[PDB]
Amino acid sequence: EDAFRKLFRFYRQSRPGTADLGAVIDFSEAHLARSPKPGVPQVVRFPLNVSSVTERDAERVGLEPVSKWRAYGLEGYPGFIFIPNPFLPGCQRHWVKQCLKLYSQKPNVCNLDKHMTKEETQGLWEQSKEVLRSKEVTKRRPRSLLERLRWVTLGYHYNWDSKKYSADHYTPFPSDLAFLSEQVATACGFQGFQAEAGILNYYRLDSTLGIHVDRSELDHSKPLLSFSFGQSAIFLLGGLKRDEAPTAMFMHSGDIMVMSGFSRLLNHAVPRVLPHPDGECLPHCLETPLPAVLPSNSLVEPCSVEDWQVCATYLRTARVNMTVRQVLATGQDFPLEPV
Ligand SMILES: O=C(O)CNC(=O)C(=O)O
Ligand SMILES: [Mn+2]
């Protein structure tokens, strides 16, 4: 049991509310500049290029203007950037809706495809709307299609067996998510980001993600983008080798991580998705609705009452994580293959 497996095991069994979580960094309380607890790296502010993204562009994808964002770094982890929920009120609902209802559809790929036909999985969303609208409801029901969703891939579909990407397996990357990833990337000083591969993870309360580094992309000089919605997660950021002791931090609804530079190839994991403190409840930021009238040419779309019902009852016991990556260095193709 190395340092990483020790912290992973601990946080997986940790007791919410108690001092077990006292070392976990919480970037959403970092503006209060409370002094760091002994043993914990220091939270430093990271200055963004506030002029690099316009306010109407930021507003197209439901982002506050960059000037309103707070970004932080961690001493000891160069390149790591953490941006507490910079979404305009209600605008997380659109992205959540997209992950549950749109991105999970053919022609993207998801964990259900290996053993379920298109016709079996097509009804995913209607199935979940029907459970909500029934009086007979609750008879020790099997897990819904929505509830059996564990991953979705976009763009270049990551191959879980080979652990490689491939030009032969591609679905065009959704353009709203790509524009969102581009704003975040620019605002962090990475203009020209190519949103080429998406991996979406769907967590239940008992879900985990083990220690790994994301090294399957061909270009390691490019930042990895990570979005979080729903229940909060304990995230462990470690070192280049799998045994260095990691630093715990929270990832709350709307939080964004950007693993650039030296941090790009660090080991990390999520040992725990924490339930809401009152039980099965949304975080407060997800109770704000979308604006009545959306700007012109908005990529954020209106979310129906019936649609948000499904998302809200799902997100009470779940977390959704979107990661966006650039796969190919600019001016490079997947190598062709020799005879
Ligand atoms: O779930 C998270 O917050 C982190 N996810 C990943 O590391 C990943 O998809 O590679
Ligand atoms: Mn990862």
Numbering used by the authors: 20 to 358
How did the manuscript describe this experimental structure?
AlkB family of 2-oxoglutarate (2OG or α-KG)-dependent oxygenases are evolutionarily conserved and implicated in nucleotide demethylation. Mouse ALKBH1 protein has 389 residues and consists of an N-terminal extension (NTE), a nucleotide-recognition lid (NRL), and a C-terminal double-stranded β helix (DSBH) domain. By establishing a reliable in vitro enzymatic assay, we demonstrated that ALKBH1 prefers bubbled and bulged DNAs, instead of ssDNA or dsDNA substrates. Structural studies of ALKBH1 in substrate-free and a 21-mer bulge DNA-bound state revealed the molecular determinants underlying the observed substrate preference, including unique features of a stretch-out Flip1 motif and a functionally indispensable N-terminal “α1” helix.
Residues 20–358 were modeled based on the electron densities. The DSBH catalytic core of ALKBH1 adopts a typical eight-stranded (I–VIII) jelly-roll fold that contains a major sheet (βI, βVIII, βIII, βVI) and a minor sheet (βVII, βIV, βV and βII) to sandwich Mn(II) and NOG at the active center. The central jelly-roll fold is notably wrapped around and stabilized by additional elements from NTE, NRL and DSBH. In particular, an N-terminal α1 helix of NTE buttresses the minor sheet from the bottom; an extended “coil-sheet” structure of NTE extends the β(V-VI) edge from the back; α3 of NTE and α7 of DSBH organize a helical cluster involving elements α2 and α8, and stack against the major sheet from the top. Moreover, the NRL subdomain composed of elements Flip1 and Flip2 attaches to the β(I) edge of the major sheet, and functionally constitutes the substrate recognition surface along with α1 helix. In contrast, three notably unique structural features to ALKBH1 arise outside the core structure: a far N-terminal α1 helix packed aside the catalytic center, the stretch-out of an extended Flip1, and a long insertion between β(VII) and β(VIII) (INS) that stabilizes Flip1 through helical cluster formation. In contrast, Flip1 of ALKBH1 assumes a fully extended conformation, which is stabilized by extensive hydrophobic and hydrogen-bonding interactions through helical cluster formation among α3 and an “INS” motif, a non-conserved long insertion between β(VII) and β (VIII) unique to ALKBH1. Conceivably, the stretch-out of Flip1 likely leads to the lack of autonomous base-flipping activity of ALKBH1, thus accounting for the observed incompetence of dsDNA demethylation by ALKBH1. The dimension of the substrate channel is ~66 Å in length and ~30 Å in diameter (left and middle), which is well-positioned for duplex substrate recognition of ~20 bp in length (contour length = 68 Å for B-form DNA).
